[PDB]
Amino acid sequence: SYVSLSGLSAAQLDLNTTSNNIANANTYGFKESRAEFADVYSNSLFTNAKTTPGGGAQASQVAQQFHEGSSIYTNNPMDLRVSGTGFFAVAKERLTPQQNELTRNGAFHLNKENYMVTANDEFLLGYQVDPSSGEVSSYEPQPINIPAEFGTGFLTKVDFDENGSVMGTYSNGENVTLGRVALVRVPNEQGLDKKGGTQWDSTQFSGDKIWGESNKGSFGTINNGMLEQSNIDMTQELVDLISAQRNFQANSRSLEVHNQLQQNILQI
Amino acid sequence: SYVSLSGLSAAQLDLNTTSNNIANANTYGFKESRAEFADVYSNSLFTNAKTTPGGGAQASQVAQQFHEGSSIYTNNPMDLRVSGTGFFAVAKERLTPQQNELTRNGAFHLNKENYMVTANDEFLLGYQVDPSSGEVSSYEPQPINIPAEFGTGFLTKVDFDENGSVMGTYSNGENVTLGRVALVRVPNEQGLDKKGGTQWDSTQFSGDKIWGESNKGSFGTINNGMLEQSNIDMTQELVDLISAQRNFQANSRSLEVHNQLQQNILQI
């Protein structure tokens, strides 16, 4: 009965993983999960080795498949998307930018301080470039501020180039580079531990955060006016839902038979 | 079953947001909404970090997208529209103009007191300019009054220039500047709370009110004889209506498959 119960648990875990995927069919930046299973084989010194029935089916690991999701077009300059490999840097507290998390959705806006923040009132981090200089001067990430008045002149339009630099043109016709969004990548994306709100944090199995610019090195490009939807396929999840239901019923039938064996002996 | 029910709630929330936009396809000054969702991956000290599948989908922010709406032409000098960034200042009580709310529709007219009021008998606020002076003398917003007689001479026509100044010509041919409409702006329009009748009020997350003139600094211009329709797109809303239905049906299919699992074990 313990072999069948392990089979029931494995299938039920598969249903919950699929149900989690289907539930997030609209959440931006979602990365689907895939349930992985392993085998059980326990043998002793005093156990016969030729006949080795399995111990069931063990849950190996719930994966976090990180393939690129499709893009939805909003025509909003503050909505951003990473086309390629890389994550946005988001800090919960403005004062400390080291306590930051990685995210893939780019639904950003400005708060009362004109800091580029996410939907959760968390601050997006970027590199500090001088208005006259070119590439990043100081590589330490800081929150991105789009001043209302620079001069003077008042902020009118904000646009992002393929290099991630946020550029603000003002009423005096002075275009000033306010910085570029910092892009973060890890050697092992699947090793990241999952927080809430479609955000990840660096772990021991996910390597160290690699701070870099967009469209540089191994990093992808940054596109404004776009968002990343879930990377799930409705057709795949629904069929997977069918297969695990068939698998669950077969394992429960095995559990039913094993019980009727014990009932049969109990009537001798 | 809770993960599937979270998907149904998220899918139906997207329906309500879309249905609200479609219903308001004709209201003046309406700003469409976008329902944004986030993931739920909660954990504890005693839960495996390897074999837990997700908690569903969580609603984040039902935003209010503030892109400019299309303009209709009515050839009515009392109908106004803000071309650019800026809101109209509207006070419910004439005596107290500090208790005011922001609006985007300019369906204005004169009451029995010859005050420029909205459709809800709420007074429009403007700056007081001397008949001989130029710019605003006192920046305190006061209700706009167009006297029947000034001198005498009787009011004949009213027109608004790009600076928002209301000019009323009288029988004696005396052109007098009776004021200019006040324009209000906030750093974070997404943070504004929604009152009834396409009207907003300032919040702590939306910053403080910025009082200024039209076509000055970051403020847009004011056009008379025009009104703003809803900033929605019917084709986009009908497509999102379809996509939200499949996002609901799939979640109910996931909900259906889990009640059949429980029924299967209930018959052993």
Next chain:
Amino acid sequence: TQWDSTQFSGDKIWGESNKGSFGTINNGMLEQSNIDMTQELVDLISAQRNFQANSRSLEVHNQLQQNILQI
């Protein structure tokens, strides 16, 4: 129908008419729109048959998810 200088448009070059690369100025004449009515009407036709086809593709995908949803 008015333009202003930007970063991508360079800086304004001030000069006289019929001097250097600048054109002449004619009084008593006005410039109409540079559109072609027949060209726009044909482009109207092409855009409608390119929106119908894309809506047809959107229908077949939807129909296919409904097919799986009834197994």
Next chain:
Amino acid sequence: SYVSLSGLSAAQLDLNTTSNNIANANTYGFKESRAEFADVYSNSLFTNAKTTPGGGAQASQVAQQFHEGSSI
């Protein structure tokens, strides 16, 4: 369905640009606009591009064709 919706949005933007040109058939000094579109191809480290289709169509830029107009 997002690839199909990309085509719908691209086709609708072309229609809007054409409608803008027709509406300004009598405005003086108007310069016509032309909608330009591009492709979408997003691939990551973990996707096998050998057999993966496109992402739809995207807008390059709505242009501002500056050819000389007729004189009245």
Next chain:
Amino acid sequence: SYVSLSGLSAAQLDLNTTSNNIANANTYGFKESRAEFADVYSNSLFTNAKTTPGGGAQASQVAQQFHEGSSIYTNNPMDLRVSGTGFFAVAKERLTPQQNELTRNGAFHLNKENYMVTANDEFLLGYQVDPSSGEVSSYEPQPINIPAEFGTGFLTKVDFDENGSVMGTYSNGENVTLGRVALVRVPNEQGLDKKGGTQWDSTQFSGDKIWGESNKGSFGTINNGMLEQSNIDMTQELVDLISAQRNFQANSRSLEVHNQLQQNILQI
């Protein structure tokens, strides 16, 4: 069920390939794609080599059919089309012209520095020819610059001959050859990896880029005032939409019979 699932996966890919083709019906320089499928079959040493089904359908490769697309006439001298075989060389950064990509759409213009650039603000590469010399002197591609003042004389008209040379006449009546657009060819166009925005790059399977002039050797001609539309056929793609849907429904019917057959034994 896995052979049935292979058919659903194969048919859905055919749907996505056709959907992407239809979506790019107006994008300039697009090359259509075709989905090619192969058989699956594997037999073990311990499996009967006669009485065993096959493994389903596996996608072979999504081709990139490079047949010439139709031409649209715009009467704009900066719009270029390659009639025949050849690609335009486009570099992202002006300083480094080695980092270049291939393209087919010819929507070019001049930036503030009067370099001939694409819509993505990327520099077209061309050969450097002396004003008095004839054929190309140095074969290394460089961004094409059209100086506003040459002498002096101011830029008046720019035209391109069948050789692709850019010729600028000036106020002093001096006809000067400013260079010719570089044309790039590959022995295997099918092996080119597809970047964003209808642009390709050289890979290991596509050989090495062959640099040459237009109307020379195997290269095609360069025509100004013309562009290339998509090379797709609306009638063919719409028919393929039906066939791929009929192929999908039959595979889901095959998948339904198997689920039904595991339920049948489950109730014995």
Next chain:
Amino acid sequence: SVRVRGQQDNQVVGQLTITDFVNPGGLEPIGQNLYLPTGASGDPQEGVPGLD
């Protein structure tokens, strides 16, 4: 093989080798989808996949 940005050709990073057994049924399963060669399994024979 992997692709490096700004560089053509596939930089080879390694070579995978698979092992075959005369009698795969003699392998001792130790769980986690892993097998250990036993006497009945036979001597493991290695090589490049697709060949030999």
